[PDB]
Write an enzyme that holds these catalytic residues in place. Structure first.
Site, PDB file in Angstrom:
ATOM      1  N   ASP A  45      12.479  -7.303 -20.124  1.00 56.91           N
ATOM      2  CA  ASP A  45      13.573  -7.328 -19.406  1.00 56.91           C
ATOM      3  C   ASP A  45      13.746  -7.733 -18.806  1.00 56.91           C
ATOM      4  O   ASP A  45      14.828  -7.280 -18.239  1.00 56.91           O
ATOM      5  CB  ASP A  45      14.046  -5.713 -19.933  1.00 56.91           C
ATOM      6  CG  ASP A  45      13.492  -4.949 -20.845  1.00 56.91           C
ATOM      7  OD1 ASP A  45      13.850  -5.396 -22.396  1.00 56.91           O
ATOM      8  OD2 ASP A  45      13.255  -3.886 -20.717  1.00 56.91           O
ATOM      9  N   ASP A  57       2.280  -9.105 -17.114  1.00 56.01           N
ATOM     10  CA  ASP A  57       2.885  -8.282 -17.601  1.00 56.01           C
ATOM     11  C   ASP A  57       4.292  -8.425 -17.315  1.00 56.01           C
ATOM     12  O   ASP A  57       4.755  -8.747 -16.580  1.00 56.01           O
ATOM     13  CB  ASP A  57       2.571  -7.831 -17.849  1.00 56.01           C
ATOM     14  CG  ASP A  57       1.318  -6.849 -18.772  1.00 56.01           C
ATOM     15  OD1 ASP A  57       1.211  -6.792 -19.665  1.00 56.01           O
ATOM     16  OD2 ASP A  57       0.254  -6.852 -17.842  1.00 56.01           O
ATOM     17  N   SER A 109       1.134  -0.814   0.058  1.00 53.50           N
ATOM     18  CA  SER A 109      -0.361   0.150  -0.767  1.00 53.50           C
ATOM     19  C   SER A 109       0.914   1.181   0.154  1.00 53.50           C
ATOM     20  O   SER A 109       1.788   1.261  -1.058  1.00 53.50           O
ATOM     21  CB  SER A 109      -0.902   0.322   1.441  1.00 53.50           C
ATOM     22  OG  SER A 109      -2.008   1.056   0.578  1.00 53.50           O
TER      23      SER A 109
END
Length: 265
Positions: free
Chosen positions: A263, A260, A135
């Site tokens: 690199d 996702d 958070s």
């Protein structure tokens, strides 16, 4: 191996990483750091392995909570990562109302506390550090990464940061929560991931609330990518590559709504 050839290949399995508490290759101990002793944060618990001397110097990781939450929101990372060979301090902040940039400063002070500590400091390579936070604490980890070059990897969990913090090139594993209504992913986690320019990976927990990576929720789910990321980037141990980025299809999990990477590893 990288810096952890003391962990045998045959122990580096998904089954072993996908476990709870201090189930891992090293036995651990803890040392309590009081609020009054801590210079720049509210005290915490240092977790360290007791039978890791064959590893040489160890990486060290500081872990910080979120807004209106204490150490127990993120404490479970301490035994998890210490049993895999890190020194780990899970902290309280000076105030549970401290903001993201303040939490970056307190992560920094907690790293320095471990490096100087009479028990674990001699076990630590001060150039191999990491930070985790939930958070507003995930915002703190992103900010810290822009300021401290010895932080080799960060793991922002449901990150919240409502001010400019700058450009992150540090290897970053973002854990996002699909249905986060506090740190909405379009405004926070997704933008932080998109704008990072180094190795980066984002796992979004399907239907997760803002609590999805806190208080041991999703502990088994997050332990494998989290431990692997920190081993790969703090310790340069490419034996954990198989659990990361294109090598591990997290989008197959019914508990993961987006995946996702770029690199990496």
């Amino acid at each position: 191996g990288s810096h952890m050839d003391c962990i045998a290949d045959s122990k580096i399995t998904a089954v072993a990483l996908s476990d709870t508490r201090d189930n891992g290759p090293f036995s651990i101990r803890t040392k309590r750091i009081s609020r009054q002793s801590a210079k720049g944060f509210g005290g915490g618990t240092i977790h360290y392995p007791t039978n890791a001397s064959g590893c040489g110097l160890l990486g060290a990781i500081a872990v910080v909570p979120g807004y209106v939450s204490y150490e127990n929101s993120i404490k479970w990372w301490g035994p998890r990562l210490a049993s895999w060979g890190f020194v780990v301090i899970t902290i309280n902040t000076n105030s549970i109302y401290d903001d993201p940039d303040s939490r970056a400063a307190q992560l920094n002070a907690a790293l320095d506390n471990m490096i100087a500590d009479d028990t674990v400091g001699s076990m630590i390579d001060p150039k191999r550090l990491g930070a985790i936070g939930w958070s507003m604490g995930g915002g703190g980890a992103l900010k810290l990464a822009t300021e401290r070059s010895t932080v080799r990897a960060i793991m922002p969990l449901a990150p919240y940061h409502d001010k400019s913090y700058g450009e992150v090139k540090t290897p970053t594993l973002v854990i996002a929560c699909e249905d986060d209504r506090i740190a909405e992913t379009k405004k926070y986690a997704n933008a932080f991931y998109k704008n990072a320019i180094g190795p980066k990976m984002k796992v979004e927990v399907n239907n997760g609330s803002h609590f999805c990576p806190s208080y041991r929720f999703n502990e088994i789910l997050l332990s494998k990518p989290g431990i692997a990321w920190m081993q790969r980037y703090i310790n340069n141990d490419t034996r954990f590559d198989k659990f990361l980025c294109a090598n591990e299809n997290y989008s197959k999990s019914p508990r993961i709504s987006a995946y996702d990477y770029k690199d990496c590893p």
